[PDB]
Amino acid sequence: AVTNEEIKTASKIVRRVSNVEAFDKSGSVFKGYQIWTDISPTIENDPNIMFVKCVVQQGSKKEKLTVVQIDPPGTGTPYDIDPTHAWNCNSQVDPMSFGDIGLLNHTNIPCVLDFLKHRYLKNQIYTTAVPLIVAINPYKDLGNTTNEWIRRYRDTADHTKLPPHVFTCAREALSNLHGVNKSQTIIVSGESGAGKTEATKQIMRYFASSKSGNMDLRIQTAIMAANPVLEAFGNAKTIRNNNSSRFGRFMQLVISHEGGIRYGSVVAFLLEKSRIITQDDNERSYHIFYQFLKGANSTMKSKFGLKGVTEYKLLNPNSTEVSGVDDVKDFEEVIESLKNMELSESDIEVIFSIVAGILTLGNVRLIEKQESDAAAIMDEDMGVFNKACELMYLDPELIKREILIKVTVAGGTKIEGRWNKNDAEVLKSSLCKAMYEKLFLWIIRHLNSRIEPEGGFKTFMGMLDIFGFEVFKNNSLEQLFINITNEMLQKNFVDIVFERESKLYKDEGISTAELKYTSNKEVINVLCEKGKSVLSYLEDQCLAPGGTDEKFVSSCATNLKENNKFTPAKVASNKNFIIQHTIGPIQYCAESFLLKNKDVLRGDLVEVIKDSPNPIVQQLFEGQVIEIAKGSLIGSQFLNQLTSLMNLINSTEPHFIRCIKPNENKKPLEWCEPKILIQLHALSILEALVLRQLGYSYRRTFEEFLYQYKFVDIAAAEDSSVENQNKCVNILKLSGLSESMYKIGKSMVFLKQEGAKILTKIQREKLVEWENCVSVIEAAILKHKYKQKVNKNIPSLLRVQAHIRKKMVAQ
């Protein structure tokens, strides 16, 4: 449902740039002239709609247009809009006829939305805004990613003659990699439920399709087998996505030039630990718990003492069932996949023993024992506790002491005491979370030990599947980390666009002094610079006795004045603050920041786990340092991960897939314009258009220019005496363009967009005596085209007409 906060932010993104040319030199309205506007009862009444199409009426005035809405259908009523509420319209263009948004005459917001929409309603869900690929979730199987479409995009001689697709990106990336021996990274971003993980798997399947076999099938099978396993352990049903990834995924892959994955390496970061302890309503925990409890056979349930999905504290008893999701069939696939990852049957039984032990431990109840206030395991549940630790291959007595016995330092003396109930529950809970997270990461380390190359990667295909910018009502620490990640990726995007444009200008002799670059250096620094940043002061406060959320906030406001990018909050300034992210201000709540940042199992508990006699459980925490140090802080560990990850990505040629969720109802063919526009903005699709249009954005070879612009000055263009490069100079000099509107390169004519549009009108003016001939030829062919489309559906029509005449008899 469209929130009034969503209408508010969507209307801030809305801008009006170019002027509407509704009048001729006479001052009369062009007969039938069409515009977009955001003023319409249709728009007040339907929150899915932000603009409507109207005809300007004979008699309007330049300062106040009189218009009548035509699409969606209206009343015929004239009404008046200020020109700043009218937008040019691409009235006669077929949106299916080309793949990039920037080929439209007008790329204002209502025009962009309408172009994507009509493509999408025809199931063409992929569109470019170079270098971006836009992918709109169709919420149905379109049939466009089968093996037959892989083979089509792979084996077609000229793939640029196919429509945009994620396979176009997979092919062009693999081709460059093998073409110039350069690593590549495909970066897939977007909000929850937009389609990033599906896109990722589609691309993976393309890369796994070899023209003539893969001798390393064993390793490819393990890599592909990991998708259901990573989804089971790391994905959960939320309100926005029945299959929400609750981690970011980075992969490296080695792929033969004809297809087939030969090596790989997987990385998961930012796992939502809290999900395993509690879940909002209508939401589940990680799929694996439900797969396991419903899918385990009677011998495994009896062995582990398993109860039903509705009988575990850690599992929301009311959301256990997800429509369209068969957890039993999913479990069978997970068990098959673990085998394909070269885990033995014994290995797999340990894995699910640990899973059953975490669940069982969650069901152990504690009580307040007062004789100071101490905690104890309810005597009724002591056996449940012991079975939980047995299932985890953990020492039951030592695990007990760590949850119940406290050691405090007062003065400079160690004083044994007792955790109270609340604290002991936190400790029991943190053991559950830590065991689950380390088991996930252990499964990945096992996978990597089977698929990685011995000596590291020479050249590799990267793939990142991560949350895009997130702006929620309550933004917390998890959102901060996500939005820092996306500032790093934004920079990767603006840098590669600049690098590539600068290189082309230089290779062609054109001056780069006119090139623009929108740095986000200041905001990255305010977030990450050592000593002078939010992450620096979150760390300091964590490492300080008597640190507080509010002191963290306070220390930030006082020390980060020298840049606008930090802004204290007007409302509740004590525990809230605002960052000026590239996509706009985002408000975070520091409440619990220090808590969440310290939520890492440390200390003697980790040493009890490492002492397990079971080899897998010993490895869960392998090599962890004994202990509060910053090496145990989520924010400090996260920034190390991020920096390492971006150094790797920045060493590659990036590709950007930007996924869009078109409505919040998981439905096909439903288009919510305010939600989509908000995503156009947060994905930098509108910005990518701007960036590309700037400067001398039109380039063509001398003979391309001449094939395109012969009739600007047909004389100069058909002079055999003068050379091609010199013909272009002649034509351009005689055209009337200002010197500022074009430059001649080594091999190309550079034009500003405005310059190319003028030259197009100039050529048409020189051809005015063909206007009527071409108009009639065109219209007559279009009528033929429209009739052929009808003829396809006539057999169907006969069936409708036939049944009508049947019902007539039956009456």
Partner: protein
């Protein structure tokens, strides 16, 4: 099956039945023949059919592949914004222009029966007439 024979006998003359009467029967039996079906049996047997050929004709007219999805194709083709609706005028022009065109009055009567509103869920219109 006896309905088959009974209806034939009401329309038979000299053991043979005219194609127009065979199509009328076939509709009484709940089949929906079209000019394509009538052209098929004309190519084989001319304009008057023996009982055996009348049964063969009823075979041609079964059209099991008929379903809401196959019938709506032409209406969906003109539904550019994908609303699922067309006005009555749109569906009237379609039914009265192409194919085994209905007369204007036949098209109106069929639309006005199914609904009294100008905009018609054409998926439901086709489901209604498929019964």
């Amino acid at each position: 099956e006896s309905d088959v024979r009974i209806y034939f006998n009401e329309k038979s003359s000299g053991g043979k039945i005219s194609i127009d009467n065979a199509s009328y029967n076939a509709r009484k039996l709940g089949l929906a023949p079209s000019s394509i079906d009538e052209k098929k049996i004309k190519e084989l047997y001319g304009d008057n059919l023996t009982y055996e050929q009348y049964l063969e004709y009823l075979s041609i007219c079964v059209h099991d592949k008929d379903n809401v999805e196959e019938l709506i194709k032409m209406f969906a083709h003109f539904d550019n914004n994908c609303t699922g609706y067309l006005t009555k005028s749109q569906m009237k022009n379609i039914l009265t222009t192409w194919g085994d065109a209905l007369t204007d009055q036949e098209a109106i009567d069929a639309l006005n029966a199914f609904s009294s509103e100008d905009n018609i869920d054409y998926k439901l219109f086709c489901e209604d007439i498929l019964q």
